[PDB]
Amino acid sequence: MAQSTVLPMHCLYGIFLEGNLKIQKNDQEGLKKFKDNIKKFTLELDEIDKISPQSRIGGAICFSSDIWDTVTKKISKPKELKSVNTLSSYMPGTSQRDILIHIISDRMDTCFKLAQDTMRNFGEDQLDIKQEIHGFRRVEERDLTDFIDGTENPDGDELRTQYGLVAAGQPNEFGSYVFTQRYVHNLKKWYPEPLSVQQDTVGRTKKDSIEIPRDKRPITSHVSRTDLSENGKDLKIVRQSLPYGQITGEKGLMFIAYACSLHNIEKQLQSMFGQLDGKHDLLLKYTTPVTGSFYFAPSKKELLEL
Amino acid sequence: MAQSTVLPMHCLYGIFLEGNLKIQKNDQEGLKKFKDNIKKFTLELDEIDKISPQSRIGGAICFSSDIWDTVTKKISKPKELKSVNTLSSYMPGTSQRDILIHIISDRMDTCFKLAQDTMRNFGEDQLDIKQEIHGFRRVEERDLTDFIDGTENPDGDELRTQYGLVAAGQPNEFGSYVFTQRYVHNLKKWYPEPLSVQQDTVGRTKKDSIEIPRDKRPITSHVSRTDLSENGKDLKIVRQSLPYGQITGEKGLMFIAYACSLHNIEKQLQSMFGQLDGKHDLLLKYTTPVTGSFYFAPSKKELLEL
Ligand code: HEM
Ligand code: HEM
Ligand SMILES: [C-]#N
Ligand SMILES: [C-]#N
C-alpha cells in the first residue's frame, strides 16, 4: 500500500531527481499527461520487479506543500507538510523543490533504466530538474567519514512501518514525510583528525560502530544530537542515505529520511543546528548541507488518485 | 601474466582515473615511493579478488610515452608508443596525460574501494588527476544510442590474448597498448532519427545487433569504418568501454581499447576521422570526443620491475 522506498533495507544504489513542475495550475491537459506519466512510473516499477527480482527495485514520487494544490484537488494536504525554506534562518542550504523521484536498486543498470525511462516520459517540458545524484553503497556500508552508517536505523517491516509511514486510519495513511539534504564532506579536514576526535564527533567507535557510553561522549556528538525522545516516545526515522561523488572531487552524503510525522525529522534538525539548546552537531565542523527539501510520498492508492 | 583488465569480459562497473605525475625525473626518493604505491595497488587487487570473488575485480596502471623515461631506466619503451596529441590535426579532444588507472568490477563498492584506496596511497603529492569517470553497464549492454555494444569484441582468453596483448617473445610481451577517449552524446539529435537511419549509422540492426551486409550499408557506417584488415589479417582490438553520465546532463561513452599493437587502434581512428578517404564516421554526427590519451599497460612483471 505504500510506495516502495521506505520498507526495504540495504539498497546498493539510489538515484535522486529533484526539481520543479513546469505545468500551470489551470493547464488541465498538461496535468492529465503528468498524471499518466506517474502511472507509467508505477507500471514500469512493477515490470522491472518481475523481470529483475535480484534488483530489489523500489521507487517513490514525492510532492512539496507548495505544489500540492497544483497536482490535486481530491487528496487533502498532509497536516504537517510545509516548505523547508522556513528553516533557512538557522539551517543552511535550503532549496525547496516541487518534486522528488527516488529510485533504489541492488543494480545500477536497472536503477538507471527506470530513472532514464521516467525522465524521458515526463520530459523537459514537464520537469525542470535541479539536481540529479547517483548514490552508491560503499564496502561495509560506511559513509565517506568511514564510519558505518545505519547501525540504529529501524530494522524490519514492522518497525519501519511504525516509524516510516503514516498510521492506518489517519488521513493520508501509508504515505510518508520525506526530507532530502545533500552534504559535501571536507575530508581534507576530517582525515587528519585523531581517532578520539572522530569518535567523539560521531558518538560510536569507528571500527565496529559500538556506542560510546553517554557519559563519555559529548552532548554535541552526532548520535547525542539525533537520538531524541518526547513523552517517552523515541523520535525515530527511516534513513535511506547513500554516499555519492568523486574520489578526486566533490563528494559527501546524499541524506534522505522517511517518517510517519515530519516533526520527528524537524526536531532532529533543530537539535543538530542549534535551535534546541544553542549547540550544534560536531559533525557540522566537517561537512556542509548544500541542498534541502521537504516532501510527502503518498500511499500508492493516493498517488494514483491525485 | 598480464594486468587484469584485458582478458575479462562483461564488467558491470569501471572507474577511469587519468592525470599527470608530479614527481621529477631527479627525485629518486619520490620515485621509490611511487613504485611502492604501484606495488600496493597490485597487492590490494589480489586481496580483493580473494575476499570478493563475485566482484571479478581487475585493474591496470598504464603509462604514456612522455612519462616513460621518468618512471623507468630499466624497461625499454614500447616500440609504437607515442602521444595522442600528434593526432590533434584531425581528431578533436586530444588531451594526453601521463598516467591511467583503470579498475573494473561487477560491484561498485569494490571498484570504488580499490580506486579510493589507490588514490589515497599515491596522494595529491604524486598524482594530479585530470579526469575521473564512473562507468556503468546498462541493461542488455547497450550504449546510450541504445545499440548493443560489444557484439564483435574478441571473445575468450585465446582471442583476447592474441589481439589485446603483445605477443610472447616480443619486447614488452604481455603488455598492452591502451587508448582512452571520452565521448559526449547528443541524444536529442539521435532519438528523432528513424530506425533505418540509426541502423545505417551503426551498420547493425538495433534490436538484435545483426550485421547489415557490407554492400547494403554506407561505407561511413561505424562498422564499415572500424572493421578493417591488412594483408588478410584483421585489425582487431579489445574494447572495455562503458556508458557514463547524468540523465539530465552530460552523458556518453567512456571509450577504452586494449591492443597488441597501437597500429590496430590508430588505423581505425584515421578511418573514423576522415584521414583515409576524406569521409567521417556517421556516428560522429551524434557524438563528440572531448578527451583522448595513448598509454601502455606493462605486463605484471615489467610493472613491478620499473
Ligand atoms: C553528513 C551527514 C551525516 C552523516 C555522515 C551521518 C552519519 C551517521 C552515522 C555514522 C550514524 C551512526 C550509525 C547509525 O546508527 O546509523 C548516524 C546515526 C544517525 N543519524 Fe546521521 N549522519 C548525517 C546526517 C544526519 C541528519 C541530517 C539526520 C537527521 C535529519 C541524521 C539522523 C541520524 C539518526 C536518527 C541516527 C541514529 C541515532 C540513534 O538513535 O542512535 N543524520 N548518522
Ligand atoms: C561514441 C563512440 C562509440 C560508440 C557509441 C560505438 C558503438 C559501437 C557499436 C554499437 C558497435 C557494434 C557492436 C559491436 O560489435 O561491438 C561498435 C563496434 C565497434 N566499434 Fe565502436 N563505438 C564507438 C567508438 C569507437 C571507437 C573510437 C573505436 C576505435 C578506436 C571503435 C571501434 C569499434 C570496433 C572495432 C567495433 C567492431 C567492428 C567489427 O569488427 O565489426 N568504436 N561500436
Ligand atoms: C545518516 N544517514
Ligand atoms: C565501442 N566501444
Residue numbers in the entry:
A (entry chain B), B (entry chain A): 1 to 306
Reproduce, without paraphrasing, sentences from the article in which this PDB structure was first reported.
A novel cytoplasmic dye-decolorizing peroxidase from Dictyostelium discoideum was investigated that oxidizes anthraquinone dyes, lignin model compounds, and general peroxidase substrates such as ABTS efficiently. Dictyostelium DyPA is a dimer, with each monomer exhibiting a two-domain, α/β ferredoxin-like fold. In solution, Dictyostelium DyPA exists as a stable dimer with the side chain of Asp146 contributing to the stabilization of the dimer interface by extending the hydrogen bond network connecting two monomers. The active site of Dictyostelium DyPA has a hexa-coordinated heme iron with a histidine residue at the proximal axial position and either an activated oxygen or CN− molecule at the distal axial position.
Since earlier studies have shown that peroxidase–CN− complexes are a good and stable mimic of the peroxidase-H2O2 bound state, we recorded the UV-Vis spectra of Dictyostelium DyPA at pH 8.0 in the presence of KCN. The absorption spectrum suggests that the binding of CN− leads to a change in the electronic state of iron from high spin to low spin. To understand the binding mode of H2O2, we crystallized and solved the structure of Dictyostelium DyPA-CN− to 1.85 Å. The asymmetric unit contains two copies of the complex. Though the binding mode of H2O2 and cyanide differ, the position of the carbon atom still mimics the position of the iron-coordinated oxygen of H2O2 during the formation of compound I. Therefore, the position of the cyanide can provide information about possible interactions between Asp149 and the iron-coordinated oxygen of H2O2. Superposition of the Dictyostelium DyPA:O2 and the cyanide complex structures shows a minor change in Cα-RMSD of 0.13 Å. The cyanide molecule takes the place of the O2 molecule in the DyPA:O2 complex structure. No changes in the conformation of active site residues are observed. This is different from the situation reported for the BadDyP-CN− complex, where a change in the location of the aspartate side chain was reported. Our O2 complex structure, as well as the CN− complex structure, shows the Asp149 in hydrogen bonding distance to the proximal oxygen of H2O2, suggesting that Asp149 can accept a proton from H2O2 and compound I can form without side-chain movement.
